Design an enzyme around this catalytic site. Sequence first.
Site, mmCIF file in Angstrom:
data_model
loop_
_atom_site.group_PDB
_atom_site.id
_atom_site.type_symbol
_atom_site.label_atom_id
_atom_site.label_comp_id
_atom_site.label_asym_id
_atom_site.label_seq_id
_atom_site.Cartn_x
_atom_site.Cartn_y
_atom_site.Cartn_z
ATOM 1 N N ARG A 26 -62.624 0.186 34.154
ATOM 2 C CA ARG A 26 -63.650 -0.335 34.844
ATOM 3 C C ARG A 26 -63.206 0.021 35.944
ATOM 4 N NH1 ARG A 26 -61.050 -5.003 38.500
ATOM 5 N NH2 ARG A 26 -59.838 -4.921 35.947
ATOM 6 N N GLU A 42 -49.847 -22.287 30.700
ATOM 7 C CA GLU A 42 -51.168 -21.518 31.613
ATOM 8 C C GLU A 42 -51.685 -22.729 30.313
ATOM 9 O OE1 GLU A 42 -52.839 -18.675 29.104
ATOM 10 O OE2 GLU A 42 -53.815 -17.429 31.060
ATOM 11 N N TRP A 48 -51.158 -15.578 36.906
ATOM 12 C CA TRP A 48 -52.442 -15.727 38.386
ATOM 13 C C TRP A 48 -51.999 -15.191 39.580
ATOM 14 C CZ3 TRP A 48 -57.723 -16.336 36.345
ATOM 15 C CH2 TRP A 48 -57.553 -16.411 35.039
ATOM 16 N N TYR A 63 -62.214 -21.078 33.964
ATOM 17 C CA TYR A 63 -61.520 -21.383 32.090
ATOM 18 C C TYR A 63 -61.493 -23.273 32.320
ATOM 19 C CZ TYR A 63 -60.386 -17.247 30.374
ATOM 20 O OH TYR A 63 -60.176 -15.403 30.160
ATOM 21 N N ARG A 89 -70.905 -27.680 12.098
ATOM 22 C CA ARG A 89 -70.714 -25.942 12.878
ATOM 23 C C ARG A 89 -71.262 -26.139 13.585
ATOM 24 N NH1 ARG A 89 -73.580 -26.375 6.659
ATOM 25 N NH2 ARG A 89 -75.245 -26.627 8.203
ATOM 26 N N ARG A 90 -70.386 -26.953 14.426
ATOM 27 C CA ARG A 90 -71.691 -26.804 15.783
ATOM 28 C C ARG A 90 -70.070 -27.332 16.558
ATOM 29 N NH1 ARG A 90 -76.718 -30.747 15.529
ATOM 30 N NH2 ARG A 90 -77.691 -29.312 13.942
ATOM 31 N N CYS A 94 -62.435 -13.593 29.493
ATOM 32 C CA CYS A 94 -62.107 -12.333 29.120
ATOM 33 C C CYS A 94 -62.018 -13.256 27.506
ATOM 34 C CB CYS A 94 -60.835 -12.452 28.885
ATOM 35 S SG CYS A 94 -60.866 -10.149 28.413
ATOM 36 N N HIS A 95 -61.565 -14.335 27.188
ATOM 37 C CA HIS A 95 -61.621 -15.276 25.968
ATOM 38 C C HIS A 95 -63.061 -16.233 26.318
ATOM 39 C CE1 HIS A 95 -58.780 -18.201 27.525
ATOM 40 N NE2 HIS A 95 -58.011 -17.282 28.178
ATOM 41 N N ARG A 124 -64.125 -11.071 24.837
ATOM 42 C CA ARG A 124 -65.419 -9.632 24.723
ATOM 43 C C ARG A 124 -65.041 -8.972 24.868
ATOM 44 N NH1 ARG A 124 -65.003 -8.952 29.963
ATOM 45 N NH2 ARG A 124 -64.368 -10.550 31.321
ATOM 46 N N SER A 125 -63.227 -8.956 25.905
ATOM 47 C CA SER A 125 -62.741 -7.342 25.730
ATOM 48 C C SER A 125 -60.827 -7.839 25.098
ATOM 49 C CB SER A 125 -62.802 -8.283 27.416
ATOM 50 O OG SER A 125 -61.410 -5.994 28.133
ATOM 51 N N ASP A 175 -56.651 -6.129 25.580
ATOM 52 C CA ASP A 175 -55.809 -4.857 25.452
ATOM 53 C C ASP A 175 -55.395 -5.189 24.015
ATOM 54 O OD1 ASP A 175 -53.792 -2.772 25.662
ATOM 55 O OD2 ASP A 175 -52.917 -4.400 27.539
ATOM 56 N N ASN A 193 -53.195 -13.789 23.946
ATOM 57 C CA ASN A 193 -54.659 -14.526 23.628
ATOM 58 C C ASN A 193 -54.469 -14.959 22.203
ATOM 59 O OD1 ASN A 193 -55.278 -13.541 25.734
ATOM 60 N ND2 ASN A 193 -57.827 -14.457 25.699
ATOM 61 N N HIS A 249 -59.308 -2.487 22.478
ATOM 62 C CA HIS A 249 -59.422 -0.867 22.803
ATOM 63 C C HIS A 249 -57.739 -0.584 23.423
ATOM 64 C CE1 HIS A 249 -59.278 -3.222 26.865
ATOM 65 N NE2 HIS A 249 -60.120 -3.804 26.327
ATOM 66 N N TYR A 294 -55.178 1.259 25.721
ATOM 67 C CA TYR A 294 -55.536 2.501 27.484
ATOM 68 C C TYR A 294 -54.359 4.039 27.311
ATOM 69 C CZ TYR A 294 -56.654 -1.497 30.332
ATOM 70 O OH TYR A 294 -57.803 -2.409 31.266
#
Lengths: 290, 290
Positions: A29, A67, A89, A115, A155-156, A175-176, A195-196, A198, A206, A236, A238
């Site tokens: 990005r 956090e 943050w 969040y 399961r919910r 991100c989470h 979703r993303s 590093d 996380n 991913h 860097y």
Amino acid sequence: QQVHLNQDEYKYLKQVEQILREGTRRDDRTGTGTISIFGMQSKYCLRNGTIPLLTTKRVYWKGVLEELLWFISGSTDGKLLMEKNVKIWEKNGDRAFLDNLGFTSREEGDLGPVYGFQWRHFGAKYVDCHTDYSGQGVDQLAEVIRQIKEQPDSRRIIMSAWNPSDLGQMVLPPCHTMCQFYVDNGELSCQLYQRSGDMGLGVPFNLASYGLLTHMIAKVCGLKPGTLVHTLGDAHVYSNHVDALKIQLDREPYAFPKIRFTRDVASIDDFTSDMIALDDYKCHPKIPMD
Amino acid sequence: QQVHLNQDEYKYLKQVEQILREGTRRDDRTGTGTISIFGMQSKYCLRNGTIPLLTTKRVYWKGVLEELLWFISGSTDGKLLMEKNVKIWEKNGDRAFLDNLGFTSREEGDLGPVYGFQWRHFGAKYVDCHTDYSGQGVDQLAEVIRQIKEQPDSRRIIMSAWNPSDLGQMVLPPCHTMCQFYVDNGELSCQLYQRSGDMGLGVPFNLASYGLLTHMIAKVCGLKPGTLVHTLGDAHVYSNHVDALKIQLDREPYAFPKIRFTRDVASIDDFTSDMIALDDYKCHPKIPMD
Ligand SMILES: O=c1ccn([C@H]2C[C@H](O)[C@@H](COP(=O)(O)O)O2)c(=O)[nH]1
Ligand SMILES: O=c1ccn([C@H]2C[C@H](O)[C@@H](COP(=O)(O)O)O2)c(=O)[nH]1
């Protein structure tokens, strides 16, 4: 033949290796070099107080700890976290970054419906990080706790921080993205969707959060901890960190540290920094990132 | 291990087989027997038109086709699927079933703010299954398509049906909770999260719909299909079907069929049943009643 003291962390190092071998060389990005695999999943054992804090590269435990409590509180104020000395943050919350997103009306550390707000007041109309929201919106964390107690085979049991409506007023998209809980034979398990990710910095942070979160809820619900399932979308590394990640790969992992709670709690809102002990957190020498 | 014409479906059979051997014996929502593993992930190649319709046990294709088109339209009325002779939602959009949930006010086909509503109008005030919602709520599918088209390196291409605010009015909480898209070298990949999945019926159905969805979105965005990642929470097999699955596990999978679109489309809302062709779907013979 691979026998390992910490099999779970070794499997993580294998994930990093696999990304570097088979990963696509796309762009970031910010226009930075990234090496990515889309869709990955790994499991970490929580069975006897064990928390997945990576021993091959030191994770900011105090950042994780303060956090998460700051998340659970439903707090969306950046200052309260900075009082505890956690500056994770800071960049996003302070004046310059807000004005760049068009939040010129907004206060000095107001992060938007981030969040903790969604976790505890989903659907509530957000205004600022000082207005009391209790009663408004869906309190998912309470619902998740209730489900575990009353309907163990549900399961919910899902908590999601992804709110399309509140994304605009958000400083930084979740991100989470969500997590699901799972009770089996008196054991509480958690699957995180991220979703993303590093692998150098974001992911291990996380792991520690949702590992810790599981332990906490496990106690609150009078259950033993089970397994953390960590699922990634864009996993991913860097391009600049490849040398740094290669140093980490050659290291044999030590045992994971253990979580110990000093006292008892009334609820999930009854946790405080001083009561979450971290035992035997041994680490390898630091990895230079420069 | 060994070579396979359809490596992808083989891996699925291996999942079912793994669930049988390692899975925990637990109870269902209606006191039925399931064997379950929490947290599972699998990938399916979509390149060159390939759609993951399983060959070792025929998937109700017309159901997949008509339900997905029905999702996309934003529709939430079950009678519309009944008109196309697809009766998968029949039992849920039913007077007695609705009255059982306390939806005494409701129409018969009205399923509530289920999938299609959340995809096209997230956050809108739901009235009934006949109202026009144009402009109201967030149109996630449209946003996803815009993101793919102009921000193809984005790590934020999510579409979620999980809306804690709307769950109570839903006839069933979403099963395919959320999906994330991913563009790499002109190839569109998608990851689906299933909170629970019956390997015998639901999963193979959900594979086909999100497989098809990816093909559609790819065509709309001028991209080629990539990979489908299928992440499961409670991956399970019913104890009743345990015999039929062992018969399925012995079958060698055939080639997955191809998807062929027979005309151009203006948007994602331009897809009609007659235009979606399914070439060479060869299946194994039916299994004696499960
Ligand atoms: O909880 C987090 C927060 C951030 N990141 C890192 C990974 C990505 O490099 C970047 C995410 O930025 P977007 O792709 O979401 O813009 O931040 C994480 O891994 N985990
Ligand atoms: O899209 C769907 C819809 C239903 N199911 C099946 C699997 C589970 O057995 C059951 C879901 O159970 P609950 O989540 O409703 O408890 O329905 C699926 O696998 N996929």
